[PDB]
Amino acid sequence: SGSEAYFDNSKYGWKDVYVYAYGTKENAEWPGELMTKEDSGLYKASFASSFKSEKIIFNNGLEKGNGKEQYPEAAGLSLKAGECKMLTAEKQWIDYGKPDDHAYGYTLTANNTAFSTESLDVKLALKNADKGYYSVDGSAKKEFANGDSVKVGEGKIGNSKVTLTLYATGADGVETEQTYTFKKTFTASKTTFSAKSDGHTTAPESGYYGTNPEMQLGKHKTISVDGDLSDWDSSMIIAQGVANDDPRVYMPSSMHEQPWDAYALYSAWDDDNLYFLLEMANTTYITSPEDNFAASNEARPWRNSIPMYLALSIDPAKQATGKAVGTNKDGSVYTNPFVWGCTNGTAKDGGTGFTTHIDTLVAFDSNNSNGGASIFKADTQDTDGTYMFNYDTRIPIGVTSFQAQDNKNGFKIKYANGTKSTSIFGINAPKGSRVMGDNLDMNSNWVDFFDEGYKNSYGYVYEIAVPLNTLGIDRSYIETQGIGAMQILTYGTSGMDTLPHDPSMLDQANLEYSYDPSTSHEKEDIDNITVPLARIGALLPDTEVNEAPFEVNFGANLNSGQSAGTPITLLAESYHATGDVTYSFTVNGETVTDSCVWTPSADGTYSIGVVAVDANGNKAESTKTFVV
């Protein structure tokens, strides 16, 4: 009955260990209640079954300015009724058997840990027993004792799961098992590129992010601005983002808020229009369905009128900071820090500025009801050589009336539910656990949400046509000189998400919104774009292109440690190859079409490998250890 928390105090050295529980209930006023030092040396605390969902903070009880220590420093660690966990000397929150008197094998690495090394050394331990057994990827049971280790992932191909079951028997004779899952990740290098002349100071984000992936610069094609996506395909994506990286996810409990989650930007052009498709995701259905509003079509972006922006670079030399300029009826010049800000209903601070070069701002709104929608040009130079967006020359694209959807000067916009991508990658960690930077870490808990129940109707799409004559260009300019684009999303003023993604969208994501500390400050702060725009039509002249090399991801389908006579499938996949790839598998250097089966007869430690050669003689090799 209830739950248990254990604390390893061997490194902290606190004289008294306190535990503070908050969630379904609060055990006591901070610093909390005193944990019990056991014979194990561990400190233990127990919570009744009413404490159904809690977060745990360990501290030494002393006050600020008198030697206060605590862990974690911010949110607590998750503990639900029925669970039993321990904070290790290495500060890992790990399962520790169950809250009973049985024996259990456990790992000193947290369950479901991802890793990109060739193996993860997991230490094993026993609760209420002194001998156990383990099986890895269904291997024969093997003895183990406290301190022993298992090379999780060793010998395996990358991007694969590992299953590890620990068996234990206590003094009550109950045999128990604990099954653990780990993922070995593999990340191929991607061809990236950047040009100094655009004034960018932050590299384009990679991993799951990508700017102009595979040198996709959009495609020449007439697009039908309806709500239908049959005229687009993946090859036209110019900026790939990720799902569930919008600011709200970094708050302790902000999944009730409407998402602003940009997933992907596509572009095309003909002789009349520049075209865009924009994908937005809504993974609340999967992450937090208890939040009814957010995990519903009530969170569709056109529910209200929210500003959106396509920022373009037409003349590449011009650098517009976002500042805006205009003239009164009496001729006097005025300036604003952004084209829109505290404007009409919006009484909120915030905005997005630009270090990367832009000179044009397509300023529209999320339900296409703002009659003031405009295309601004930075056509007026400031004293510092920067350019300012001009109210006096703005091209109006707004509707005359919301019901007519009759935008001026040729601007077309249609929005709808839907999803063009067939995969929706994003981190699916428990609410409140998100950490700054985890969108750049390949060992975060990444999932394809289509494998967790995502549906096409969950997401949202916008299809947009901007007439070339409203940008001062033609098709030939796009295809020989090229331009840059970025989609910005807001929640009223400040940016929230961009494609290409910019880190200033999340540099303050965990700070508190001034009007409601449960929601993110990113709604109201000042963003500053420093990544490269996505190119359309052609590359900037001084572009340095980093070509990813031809490489291979190789390994076994079962973890090292199988039994003799077990068939072991060796697998290989290649990346960035030219034409036909020829694989050549070996065991101890002895050769054994993209895979092959190897049955070892005798025990021992083997070297498995593959050499891969493509049609231009490019070679890639991998060699790994497999033990039986």
Interface residues with Ca ion (CB under 5 A) are 224, 226, 228, 231, 241, 245, 261-262, 494-495, 497, 504, 507-508, 522, 525, 527
25 CB-near residues (< 8 Å, 6+ apart): 50, 51, 54
- Is residue 453 within 8 Å of residue 311, measured between CB atoms? no
Q: What is the CA radius of gyration of the chain?
A: 28
Cα 39 off chain centre by: 43
Distance CA 536, CA 437 (A): 28
Residue in the shown chain whose Cβ atom is closest to Ca ion: 494
**Least distance between Ca ion and beta carbon 212 (Å):** 17
97 CB-near residues (< 8 Å, 6+ apart): 84, 103, 104, 106, 127, 128, 176, 178
**C-alpha to C-alpha distances, 503 to 201, 241, 323, nearest whole angstrom:** 11, 12, 21
- Output 51 or 285, the one with its CB closest to Ca ion: 285
- Output 509 or 577, the one with its CB closest to Ca ion: 509
- Output 240 or 553, the one with its CB closest to Ca ion: 240
- Output 87 or 413, the one with its CB closest to Ca ion: 413
- Output 153 or 492, the one with its CB closest to Ca ion: 492
Residues forming a β-bridge with 387: 320, 381
In this structure, what is the dihedral angle of CA atoms 284, 287, 293, 298, given to the nearest 10 degrees? 20
**Least distance between Ca ion and beta carbon 470 (Å):** 20
**Least distance between Ca ion and beta carbon 557 (Å):** 33
- Output 262 or 274, the one with its CB closest to Ca ion: 262
**Least distance between Ca ion and beta carbon 503 (Å):** 8
**Least distance between Ca ion and beta carbon 393 (Å):** 28
**Least distance between Ca ion and beta carbon 261 (Å):** 4
Distance CA 187, CA 207 (A): 8
**Least distance between Ca ion and beta carbon 522 (Å):** 4
**Least distance between Ca ion and beta carbon 282 (Å):** 11
- Output 83 or 231, the one with its CB closest to Ca ion: 231
- Output 106 or 425, the one with its CB closest to Ca ion: 425
User: Considering only CA atoms, which of 286, 245, 287, 236 is closest in space to residue 263?
Assistant: 245
- Output 379 or 522, the one with its CB closest to Ca ion: 522
**Least distance between Ca ion and beta carbon 233 (Å):** 12
**Least distance between Ca ion and beta carbon 271 (Å):** 18
- Output 495 or 532, the one with its CB closest to Ca ion: 495
- Output 107 or 244, the one with its CB closest to Ca ion: 244
**Least distance between Ca ion and beta carbon 590 (Å):** 49
- Is residue 267 within 8 Å of residue 238, measured between CB atoms? yes
**Least distance between Ca ion and beta carbon 508 (Å):** 5
- Is residue 3 within 8 Å of residue 81, measured between CB atoms? yes
The three-state (H, E, C) secondary structure of 436-497, written as one string: CCHHHCCCCCEEEHHHCCCCHHHCEEEEEEEEHHHCCCCHHHHHHCCEEEEEEEECCCCEEE
Distance CA 16, CA 35 (A): 8
- Is residue 375 within 8 Å of residue 362, measured between CB atoms? yes
In this structure, what is the dihedral angle of CA atoms 199, 203, 206, 212, given to the nearest 10 degrees? 30
List, as one string, the DSSP characters of 348-395. ---EEEESS---EEEEEETTS--TT-EEEEEEEE-TTS-EEEESTTPE
- Is residue 91 within 8 Å of residue 69, measured between CB atoms? no
Tokens of 85: 């966990």
- 132-136, strands of its sheet edge to edge: 114-115, 175-184, 160-169, 132-136, 142-144
- Output 239 or 612, the one with its CB closest to Ca ion: 239
Distance CA 564, CA 606 (A): 12
